[PDB]
Amino acid sequence: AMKDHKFWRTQPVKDFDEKVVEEGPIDKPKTPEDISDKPLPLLSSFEWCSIDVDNKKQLEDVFVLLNENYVEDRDAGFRFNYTKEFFNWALKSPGWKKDWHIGVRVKETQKLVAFISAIPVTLGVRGKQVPSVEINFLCVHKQLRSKRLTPVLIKEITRRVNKCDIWHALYTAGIVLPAPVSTCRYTHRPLNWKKLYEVDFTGLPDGHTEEDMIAENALPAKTKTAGLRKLKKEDIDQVFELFKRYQSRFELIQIFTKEEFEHNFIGEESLPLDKQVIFSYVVEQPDGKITDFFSFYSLPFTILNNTKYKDLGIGYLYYYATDADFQFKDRFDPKATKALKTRLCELIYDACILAKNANMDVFNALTSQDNTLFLDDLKFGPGDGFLNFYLFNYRAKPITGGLNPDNSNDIKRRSNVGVVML
Ligand SMILES: CCCCCCCCCCCCCC(=O)CSCCNC(=O)CCNC(=O)[C@@H](O)C(C)(C)COP(=O)(O)OP(=O)(O)OC[C@H]1O[C@@H](n2cnc3c(N)ncnc32)[C@H](O)[C@@H]1OP(=O)(O)O
Ligand SMILES: Cc1nccn1CCCCc1ccc(CC(=O)N[C@@H](CO)C(=O)N[C@@H](CCCCN)C(=O)NCCC2CCCCC2)cc1
Numbered sequence: 001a002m003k004d005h006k007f008w009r010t011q012p013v014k015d016f017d018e019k020v021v022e023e024g025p026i027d028k029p030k031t032p033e034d035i036s037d038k039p040l041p042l043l044s045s046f047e048w049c050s051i052d053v054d055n056k057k058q059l060e061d062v063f064v065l066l067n068e069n070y071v072e073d074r075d076a077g078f079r080f081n082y083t084k085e086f087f088n089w090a091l092k093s094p095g096w097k098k099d100w101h102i103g104v105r106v107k108e109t110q111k112l113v114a115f116i117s118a119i120p121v122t123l124g125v126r127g128k129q130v131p132s133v134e135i136n137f138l139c140v141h142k143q144l145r146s147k148r149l150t151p152v153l154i155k156e157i158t159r160r161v162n163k164c165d166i167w168h169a170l171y172t173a174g175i176v177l178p179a180p181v182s183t184c185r186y187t188h189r190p191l192n193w194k195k196l197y198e199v200d201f202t203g204l205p206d207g208h209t210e211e212d213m214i215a216e217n218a219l220p221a222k223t224k225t226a227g228l229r230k231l232k233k234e235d236i237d238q239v240f241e242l243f244k245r246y247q248s249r250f251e252l253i254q255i256f257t258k259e260e261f262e263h264n265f266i267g268e269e270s271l272p273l274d275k276q277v278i279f280s281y282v283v284e285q286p287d288g289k290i291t292d293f294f295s296f297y298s299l300p301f302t303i304l305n306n307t308k309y310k311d312l313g314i315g316y317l318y319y320y321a322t323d324a325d326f327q328f329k330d331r332f333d334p335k336a337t338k339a340l341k342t343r344l345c346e347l348i349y350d351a352c353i354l355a356k357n358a359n360m361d362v363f364n365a366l367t368s369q370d371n372t373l374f375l376d377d378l379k380f381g382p383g384d385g386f387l388n389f390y391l392f393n394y395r396a397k398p399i400t401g402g403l404n405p406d407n408s409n410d411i412k413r414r415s416n417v418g419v420v421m422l
Contacts, residue, residue, distance in 0.1 A: 002178055007151040012393040014179030020395045023125055025167065027393055035162045040155055042104065048156070049103035049112070053091045059084050061112040062103070067302065069142045071174075074384060077200065078301040078312065086277045086299065089267055090136075090422050094260040095120040097164075100133070102157055104149070113141040116153040118161055121260075123170060124253040124418070125396050132168035133161050134254075135392075136421060158392075169392035172421045174385060181252065181391055182368075182417045184401035186383035187375050187409075189363040191315075191356035193217040199309050201362060202381075217379065221357075223350040227283035227292065235282055236262055239293050239321075246321035249332075250369065251399040252389070253418030265295055265319070278318070279358060281351075294320030294347050296355060296363075297422070315360035317351055318420055320369075332414075341373040348374050367402035368417040372409045382407075389417060 002009050002016060012026035039048050051058045063084050072079040091101060096119045104114035117137040123130040135157070140149055161169070188201075193213050196202045204213065231239065240258050247253050256264065265280040276298065283292030294317070301312035324343035329336035348365075355363045365371050365380055366387065374380075389401070399416035402409055 005177065007148070008178055011178075013177075014181075014391070014395055016178065020397055023128065023395050023397055025393055026395060027167065030162065030167065032163050032165050035159060037163070040152055040159065042149075042152060045106055045108065046104055046113070047107045049105045050098050051101040051103045051115075052098045053088060053096075053101065059087055062101075062115055063087060065112045065115055065141065066137065066139050070139050072304075073301075077305050078303055081300040081302045081311070083275070083277070083300075085268075085271060085275050086297075086422075089263075089277050091117065091119065093119045093263055094257070099160055100157065102153065102160070104153065113144055114149060114153060115139050116157050118157050118169070120164075120166065121170065122255045122257075123168070124255045125391070125394065126251050129255065130168050130394065131166055132170055132392075133166050134421075135169050135171035168394050170389070170419065171392060172387050172389045174387060176388060177390065179390055179396075180388040181396045182389050182399045182401040182415075183403060184366040184368045184387050184389075184415070184417065185403060185407060185409075186385050186387065187365050187367065187371075187380035188383055189352050189365070189378060189380045190217045190361075191219065191352065191363055192313075192361040195309065195361050196312075199303050199306050199312065201312065219353050219356050221353075223353045225283065225292075225346065225350050227285050227290070228350055229282060229284055231266060231280040231282045231293070231295075233262065233266065235284075235290060238290055239282060242290070242293060242323070243319065243321040245326070246323075247418050250418030251416035252396070273358065276358070279315070279354065280318075281354065291323050292343075292347060293322070294318075294351055296351055298358070298360060299422075313359050313361040315351075315355035315358065315363050317348065317363065317365040317371075320347065320351075322347065337373070340370060341377075344370060345374040345377050348378055352378065366420070367409055368415045368420065370414050372402040372411050372414045375409050376411070387421070389419070389421075 051062055053059055066082055070080050100118040102116050103112050105112050115137055118133040118135050121132055121134045123132050190196050194210060240261055267278045278295060278297045280295035282290045284290040296315050296317045298315050300314055303309050303312050322343050325336040325340035328339050352363050401417045402415040404410040
């Protein structure tokens with residue numbers, strides 16, 4: 001259908017038909033001297049803008065913008081609540097630039113009415129290093145939808161990034177578009193089933209009673225794992241080396257330096273429990289050789305439409321890593337596959353205890369990576385929403401996000417997708 005995308009049909013992206021043999025760039029090489037130094041045009045009523053995260057009324061402009069016009073569920077009763085803190089983490093990774101925090105203020109009043117964003121990252125498509133940028137936070141004010149302002153924001157953020165000599169991008173979106181490299185599904189391990197129920201995040205399956213469900217989803221008040229401790233700087237190297245090792249396993253990943261890792265996993269110390277964004281943990285055995293690591297972050301829902309409650313606490317399982325299976329085999333071979341499982345099913349379970357204890361009403365995950373071994377087992381239910389990963393200017397061989405054709409967790413053949421968008 002690429003032809004019906006009046007805009008996308010002009011972009012360096014893979015296609016629906018097109019099968020590939022050799023993964024590589026889509027445009028004939030370019031160089032910054034080739035790119036325009038002039039920001040694109042926009043109706044006279046509006047002026048481009050650049051957002052300094054460290055400016056307080058600018059962060060404020062964005063936080064408000066997205067807080068009222070960003071992504072909602074398919075039925076519009078819940079909306080993402082990205083907090084200023086969260087922005088402070090995600091928009092300032094190492095290498096970030098204010099020139100890539102593009103805003104679009106209306107000139108007469110200056111009201112921020114559009115945003116699009118890029119932070120730099122280095123991909124690992126089938127192990128082939130690829131200097132790219134990661135895109136996220138594309139948002140246009142509700143009263144400005146359909147004015148086809150988006151292709152501009154893209155055309156403009158692309159332009160700025162080319163000017164820094166980068167030519168590739170990783171972006172994920174829900175809607176279907178040109179080259180889904182892979183796809184995944186969100187799932188939900190209820191922490192506060194009754195509340196989820198009282199705000200219509202879920203319903204009551206027949207033959208069941210709140211007690212039944214409430215008991216069915218019950219979680220221990222204390223984690224069940226020795227060595228289970230929360231990451232510190234001191235660990236980085238072993239951890240980082242551990243993570244690096246583990247993720248080797250997937251066809252599509254981010255190639256974290258050590259710094260743009262520590263930042264990604266240990267957030268600003270100042271912040272209190274109700275503010276904190278990233279929750280990273282590790283398992284330090286007696287001899288020290290920490291063997292386990294997993295993280296998750298907090299990204300609530302603004303419960304629009306409800307009188308019983310105004311906010312939903314949600315914890316998204318982030319990155320994780322474990323030595324189980326590999327020190328064992330070569331192939332992800334059975335005796336080793338199930339070897340991981342039990343160890344995984346044991347980690348995440350504590351993630352759910354941990355997340356629950358941090359006040360998260362529901363714990364989410366994606367059927368990407370080896371999520372599939374523990375999901376069903378750990379009671380992660382099927383979400384109604386899905387996520388599509390894409391690559392701008394790059395021929396990639398379709399990779400795996402854990403879904404059998406009936407959108408069922410593919411427990412056998414897991415997921416080749418290694419990144420985890422924020
Ligand atoms: C190497 C450098 C290059 C780097 C750049 C790489 C690509 C980046 C672009 C992708 C950015 C998405 C990433 C994320 O942020 C995560 S996903 C988070 C996304 N956020 C939201 O959904 C928040 C709430 N929604 C809105 O704010 C939305 O308003 C909107 C901004 C998403 C879309 O704006 P709009 O509804 O007013 O439509 P429009 O008239 O302005 O433009 C339409 C054209 O753009 C495409 N259109 C509509 N929604 C789209 C979407 N989410 N992604 C992409 N295209 C979209 C369409 O396919 C179409 O074009 P066609 O004619 O071709 O069909
Ligand atoms: C990069 C990025 N980060 C965040 C967003 N994006 C990009 C935007 C495109 C990705 C996207 C769009 C919209 C959403 C919101 C969303 O889809 N929410 C769904 C996720 O699946 C949801 O809340 N599902 C819940 C509630 C929806 C109810 C209203 N329809 C569900 O299935 N709940 C039932 C769970 C239940 C299963 C059984 C066990 C108990 C829990 C998520 C991601």
